[PDB]
Amino acid sequence: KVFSKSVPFLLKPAGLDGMVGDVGFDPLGFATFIDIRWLREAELKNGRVAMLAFLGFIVQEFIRLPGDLYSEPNGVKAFFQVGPQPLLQIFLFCGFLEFNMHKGKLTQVDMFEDGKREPGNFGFDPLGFGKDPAKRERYALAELKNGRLAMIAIGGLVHHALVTGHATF
Amino acid sequence: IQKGSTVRILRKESYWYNESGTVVVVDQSKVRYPVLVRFTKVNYAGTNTNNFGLNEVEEVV
Amino acid sequence: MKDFLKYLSTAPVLLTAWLTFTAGFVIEINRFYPDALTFPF
Amino acid sequence: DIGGLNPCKDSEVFQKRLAKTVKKLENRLKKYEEGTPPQIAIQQQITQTKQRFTRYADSNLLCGNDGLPHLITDGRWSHGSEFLLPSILFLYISGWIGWVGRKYIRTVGQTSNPTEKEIIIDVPLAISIMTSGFLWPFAAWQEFLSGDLIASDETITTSP
Amino acid sequence: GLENQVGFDIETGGKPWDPFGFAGVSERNGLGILPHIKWLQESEIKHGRTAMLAFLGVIVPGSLGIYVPTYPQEPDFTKAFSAALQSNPLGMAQIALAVAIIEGHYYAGDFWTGGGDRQVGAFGFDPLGFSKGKSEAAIKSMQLKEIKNGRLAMIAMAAFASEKFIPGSVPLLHSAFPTL
Amino acid sequence: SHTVKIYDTCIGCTQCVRACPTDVLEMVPWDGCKAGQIASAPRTEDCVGCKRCETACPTDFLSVRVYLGGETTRSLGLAY
Ligand code: CLA
Ligand code: CLA
Ligand SMILES: CC(/C=C/C=C(C)/C=C/[C@@]12O[C@]1(C)C[C@@H](O)CC2(C)C)=C\C=C\C=C(C)\C=C\C=C(C)\C=C\[C@@]12O[C@]1(C)C[C@@H](O)CC2(C)C
C-alpha cells in the first residue's frame, strides 16, 4: 500500500495523479464520485472569485467610490446599502461572462463531455505571463494555493463583519 | 429477417404493436407464424416473447 | 461500508432523506421569514 | 380600486381585526405569571401578529369588506408580487424538477439494467443531473429545436 | 434554408442571424402550426414597410407641422387617429377600404405552409423603373437595403412606443426630435 | 351454454386443456404449429365460463376465447 503524502495514515486517493496540486489530500474521496476535471474547474473558479472578493473587501473599506450609495466601509452592510440594482447588473454581467467563456457548455454533464478542455484553462493571458513552461507549473500551484487561502480568508472576513459589524481594518 | 434482426410488429392485436423487437429464430418449416421475436417490455400476462408471421414483422433499417 | 452505502442509495432511504431535507428548509424559511403571503420583493 | 376593493392600510375592518386579535392574545397573557416562558411565547405571538398586520398593510394589498387581503391575479404588474412573481418562481422550480427527472430517466434508460437504477438511484449520476437543472428553460429550448424532446411514431397506440 | 435568402450581411458575421431558430420550426412536428419561412419573410416586408411609413407619419406631421387642410392639428400620434376618426370619418373609412383592398389582392395565406405563386413582397409596383434592368446581385442588394431599412424603422417605432410608455427609455430621442 | 373458439395462433402447449375444470377442451391433431396439435372445444355444454382456459394461454392475445352466452344449470355451476 502507498498511503497518502498529506494524510499519512490514509491510503492514497485515486484520480488525482496528473494534477498540478496533488498532495494526496482527499480523505472523503470526492474525486471518486465527482469528475476530477469538474472538481478542479470548480476549485479554480471558487479560488479566483474568493481572491477578487478579498481584494474587493480591502479596497472597499479603504478607497470606496464617490456617492451616497457607495459610502459603507463594511462589505456586508455595503451589500445592502448599494441596493438591488447595482448587484443585479453584476449578476447579469457574471452570467454573460460565464456563458461566453465556457461557450455554451456550462453544466457538469455538458462540460468536459467532449474533453479537449484543460480544467480552468480559459486562455486568458493578455500580459503574456506564462509563455515559459518552466515557471508555468509553479504559477499554477501558486494560483491554487492562493485561491484556497483566499477562500478561507473570504469566509473569515465575511464572518468577522457579521459578528462585529464595523469593518476589517 | 434472421436471428438477431430488429423488426417492427405490425400485428394490431399485439402488446408490442408499432414497437421494435429482436428476432430469436425464423422457422424454416411450413408453420403459420415462424418468426419468434423477443421484447424488453413484458406484456400484461408477463411474457416477453411471441411468434409472428412473416407479413406481421417489418425489419428496421 | 460498500453495501451500506448501496442500501442508503435505495429509493425509500433516499426519498426519506430528500423529503426530510425539503421539509427542513421549508420550515426554516417559514421560521426566519414567517407569514409571507406575497413575494418579498 | 380594482374590483371595488380598497387598500388594507385604509381599511377600518382590517384594523378592527388586528385590535381584536391583539386583545384576545393579551387577555390570554393576563392569566400567566411574570417572565415565565408562557408569557414570553404569548408576547412573541403578539409581536408577530402586529408585524404581520403591519407588513400586509404596507404591501399594496387590497382588502374587501371583510378586512382580509384579496389577491389581484388578472395579470397586472401592479399586483405582480401576489401571483405573477410566485408563478414564475414555481415554474422555474417545477421545470427544474421535471427536467432533472426526465434527464435521469433518459440517461439510465440506455444502460444494461434500466429498472434497477430506478429503485436504487445512481446517486453520483443523480447529483450530476440535479444540479444541471438550473438551465432547464435553455436546455428545453435547445432539445425541442433538435427534435430530441418529442417522440413521433414509436409511441404505442391502442387498437382503435 | 436561411443561407439562400436575402436578409443577412456583415453586421451579424456572414451567417443569417437567428438566435432562436424560428426559421426552422415550420419543418418540425405538426402538419402546420408554426409559420413557414416564406410567411415570416412576408411579415418582414409588410412590417418594415408599415414601420417606415409610420416613422414618416409621426415625423412629418408631428414635428414639421405639415397638415392636410381639413384635418385636426394634433402633433401627437396617440390622439391623431381618434381626432381624424371624428373630424374626417370619410377619409379614414376610405383609407381602411384601400388598405383592405390592397391586402386582399396581395393575400399571403398560402405562405403559412409554404408555397404560392407570388414571391416575398413581390407586389409588382415598379412605377419609376428603379429595377427596370439590373443584375441579379443588384436586385438582391436593393432588397437587402429595403429589409434593413424596414428593420431600422421597426426599431425606431418601437423606441417611440417605449418612450411614450416608459419615460427615459430612449435617451437621445427627445434630443433628436425636439418637437413632439 | 357459453361459446369457446380456438384460433390458429394456437401453439399446442396444452395448458388450456389441463386447466379446464369441466373437461371442455381437448388436444387434437393439427399441422399449423410445431407441436402438431391444436386445442378443440367439443364439450362446450359443460363450459362453466370460469375462463381458466385463457388464463393459461401463452399466445399474445389468446388462442382460446370464451364468449359468455345463455345460461344453463351446468354453465351456472348449480349443484342444486
Ligand atoms: C468578486 C468580485 C467583486 C464583487 C462581487 C464586488 C462587489 C461590490 N463592490 Mg467591489 N471590488 C472588487 C471586487 C468585487 N466587488 C475588487 C477586486 C476591487 C479592487 C479594484 C473592488 C473595489 C471596489 C470599490 C472601490 C468599490 C466597490 C464597491 C462594490 C459594491 C458596489 C458595486 C460597485 O460599484 O463595484 C465597483 C467595483 C469595481 C470598480 C472593481 C472592478 C471589478 C473587479 C476588478 C472585478 C473585475 C472582474 C473582471 C470583469 C473579469 C475578470 C476577467 C475574466 C476573463 C475572468 C459591490 C458590493 C463599491 C462600494 O459599495 O463600496 C463599499 C465601491 O466604492 N468595489
Ligand atoms: C370567416 C371569415 C372569412 C372568410 C372565410 C373569408 C374568405 C375569403 N375572403 Mg374575406 N374578409 C373577411 C372574412 C372572411 N373572408 C372580413 C371580415 C373582411 C373584412 C371586411 C374580408 C375582406 C376580404 C377582401 C377585401 C377580400 C377577401 C377575399 C376572400 C377570399 C379569398 C382570399 C382571402 O381569404 O383573403 C382575404 C383574407 C382575409 C380578409 C382574412 C380574414 C380573417 C378573418 C377576419 C378571421 C376570422 C376567423 C375567425 C376564427 C372566425 C370566428 C368564427 C366564429 C367564432 C364567429 C375568401 C373566399 C378576397 C376575395 O374576394 O377574392 C375574390 C378579397 O379580395 N376578404
Ligand atoms: C468554514 C470554512 C473553512 C473551514 C476550513 C477548515 C475547517 C479547514 C481545516 C483544514 O485546514 C486545516 C485547519 C488543516 C488542513 O491541513 C486540513 C483541513 C481540514 C483542510 C470556510 C467558510 C467560508 C464561508 C464563506 C466563504 C462565506 C461567505 C459568505 C458570503 C459571501 C455571504 C454573503 C451574504 O452574507 C452577506 C454578505 C449578506 C447576506 O444577507 C446575504 C449573503 C449573500 C448570504
Ligand code: SF4
Ligand atoms: S371456461 Fe375456460 S376453463 Fe372453464 S371450462 Fe369453459 S373453457 Fe375450460
